[PDB]
Design a binder for these strands. Structure first.
Lengths: 96, 93, 82, 78, 85, 77, 92, 94
DNA sequence: TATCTGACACGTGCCTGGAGACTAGGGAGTAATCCCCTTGGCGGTTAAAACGCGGGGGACAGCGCGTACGTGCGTTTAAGCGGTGCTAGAGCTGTCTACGACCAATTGAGCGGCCTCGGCACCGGG
DNA sequence: CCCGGTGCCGAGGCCGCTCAATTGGTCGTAGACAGCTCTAGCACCGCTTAAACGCACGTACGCGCTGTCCCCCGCGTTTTAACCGCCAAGGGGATTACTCCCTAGTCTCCAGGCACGTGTCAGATA
């Protein structure tokens, strides 16, 4: 597969990440494996948070995730909450 | 006017994880902003690492160490595992 | 067009609902004025930075992204607005 | 709590924001999205403030939050 | 009171050095074996930890005073940690 | 190990912090709190060091680690 | 071979309090403080540049970044003296 | 020099070398380093003014960390600026 | 509870970002050396801490009284919808050019050592 | 301690080496400016009704007080290891030189992404 993401078996766009890194002036040069690693991490985190969002929606018997569910997932998971404890979610609400 | 967003990829990941589950536009927007935020934070940390070690390039090593810094314990470990696995997989081809 | 004392627009029931969402049960009357003051201060701070951002960009229209950045200055990152 | 529907009335809040801005620089416009973002931020901030104030009140073995509690929470937040 | 004024007046460190160094080294050994610490880095940790600790007690005292008490208590420190986040 | 933080040391610390009377449990609680705080700072400093492929933590390592904690430390180059 | 601002801070000390000295320990604090503020303003300005998609950190960027980081009156005086110096530099 | 051109004591060239090296942007404006150096000069001037005042009040001709700590914590605006800042040997306000 | 629907999901069409090959250069990996700081161990002093005791100031509980807040009902206000109409300003493109990047060549400011000197504390007698 | 002289040692001045700042000039293009355009914001108008305001009430909570009981504080005494200074050595940080290897850059090639147009069912609308 010509696309690097496919090479790495990741759904995220490796090329886009690389372009952003170069364009975002974080460093003069960008390692070849660096976008790969970063995309892997981003995909992992998104998958993680979406796991809990979907589980919450299941608990709410809703096929569609909404900011309420994301707020619930973030606040309930101790780790994410620590990572995103300084965050605000549009229509997020708060845990009862 | 073309405009970037990760909505497509987030949707793909949602299919991977909760295949039978949709997502509202607002939720997708939140996810998009979330991805941008962490991407930026990791990139900034990698840049600071590079400049602290007087190294002019952001290699996989820097991003690994950056993830180990930003994320909390268990998340950091899992993410590092995932990242190194993906890099190995990619380098294999 | 002129404006005046719109701080009162945050009516007592509004603040009471806010606190209720915060888990408070019983609220002293003196709270309302203090909360109005704190909200005013918070808005002063955020809007100062947002207006600064706009002025720099040579614009006359505060855009949501501008407020998002201003909040980020405060260390109160906001999601769902780009 | 069960919901997430905004709690402060929209228009009065908008007029508040405009009044505040009036003291920084005149004739500034605000995208409705900007007003919404400010409102969401204020709502979240005040909810957090009241959560902390409630914690302090419980600490004092009281049930009725009092301005002293708010002051304490703001201060300990550094 | 006299001790309070005496200590607040000066800037000499309070935690005895060698014990704190041993503490830091124990924790580091827990993280990763056979690391070495410059005396400067241990001094930096000394300073940062003592300042942080002092701030913590300042907040705890504020909370206790709020609670009408004069003697700080674990509850006060819990509150100070929580509110501050 | 941790108990090297002598009760009197905490008393002096709190005195500098303005406290006047201290409950017994305060000592153990403070010991634990400081232990956690160090654990965090040293984790970050050690990570910074390991990334530099060095074996000796350095003052700058700790300075950056505190900088991440929002604890800018001045006076260490 | 290492850099610092120590000598310049010393010159400022003589500018403001002709008859005052400073401990090397204090000069280290002064130096790190200058480094910290400089870094904060520089990163702030870099973001201002990127945020509006300009590649140049011009004086305007630094001015707005200072107006952001510092509190009110301190920012007022800072911008005052900064603009003043910029004008003079162009004058000569 | 350039600092002389602006009457500033701080090194315009040094600030300029740092703006470039630190990769804060593709390019760097000509007046940007001038402005930034002036700002740093002003801020250090204020800190040092307060420190010298405190030392005089303390009957000392050589400034020391405690004096800086006092100066910072006493001034409202600076304290706001350096609230998250811990100073080596700083001590605490009485 | 249809139904509808438009919000999600689906096709298609375009094209623009992404991918592959080649190059070259400087950036990073490596090793080799130099030497410094780091640890470690001992003995000596002694201040610092550890332990015990006595009492008493302070935490905690209970009680009593007052009153400020929650509740409800009725009355009032404007917040919200739409809706409609106007344009100021954002956004986008096109043009020019003033300003910054590189580099070559020169100079003295800064750096570090060298020395020297009395301010603040060391030192040795009161 | 004080106290004058010491001293010392951190400040402070000086010396000289110098390498990074300065300067000139050139070339490129980022950025300034203008022109168009098309929304998105503003206002205003009417209406509806939901929300807010106020009154009255009563009662649950804050607050002061007491009264106990006991947990810290201060003192004294006894034990300890923290600090010290030395010295020994040796591991690694720093510095340098050298190599090859990776990445920016380019061209060139094209297909997944994204917009826009389109179908259709989960949840809102009916």
């Amino acid at each position: 597969a010509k696309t690097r993401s496919s090479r790495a078996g990741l759904q995220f766009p490796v090329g886009r990440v690389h372009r952003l890194l170069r364009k975002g002036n974080y460093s003069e040069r960008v390692g070849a494996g660096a976008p790969v690693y970063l995309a892997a991490v981003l995909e992992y985190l998104t998958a993680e948070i979406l796991e809990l969002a979907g589980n919450a929606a299941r608990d709410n018997k809703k096929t569609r995730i909404i900011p309420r569910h994301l707020q619930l997932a973030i606040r309930n998971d101790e780790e994410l909450n620590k990572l995103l404890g300084r965050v605000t979610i549009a229509q997020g609400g708060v845990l009862p | 006017g073309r405009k970037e967003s990760y909505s497509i990829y987030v949707y793909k990941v949602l299919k991977q994880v909760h295949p039978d589950t949709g997502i509202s536009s607002k939720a997708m927007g939140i996810m998009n902003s979330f991805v941008n935020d962490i991407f930026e934070r990791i990139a900034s940390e990698a840049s600071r690492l590079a400049h602290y070690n007087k190294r002019s390039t952001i290699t996989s090593r820097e991003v690994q160490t950056a993830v180990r810094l930003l994320l909390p314990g268990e998340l950091a470990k899992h993410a590092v595992s995932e990242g190194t696995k993906a890099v190995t997989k990619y380098t294999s081809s | 067009k002129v404006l005046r004392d719109n701080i009162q627009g945050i009516t007592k029931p509004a603040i009471r609902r806010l606190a209720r969402r915060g888990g408070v049960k019983r609220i002293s009357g003196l709270i309302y004025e203090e909360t109005r003051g704190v909200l005013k201060v918070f808005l002063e701070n955020v809007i100062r930075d947002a207006v600064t951002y706009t002025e720099h960009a040579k614009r006359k229209t505060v855009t949501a992204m501008d407020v998002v950045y201003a909040l980020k200055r405060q260390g109160r990152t906001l999601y769902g607005f780009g | 709590q069960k919901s997430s529907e905004l709690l402060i009335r929209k228009l009065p809040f908008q007029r508040l924001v405009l009044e505040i801005a009036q003291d920084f620089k005149t004739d500034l416009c605000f995208q409705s999205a900007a007003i919404g973002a400010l409102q969401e931020a204020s709502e979240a901030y005040l909810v957090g403030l009241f959560e902390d104030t409630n914690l302090c009140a419980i600490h004092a073995k009281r049930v009725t939050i009092m301005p002293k509690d708010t002051q304490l929470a703001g201060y300990i937040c550094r």
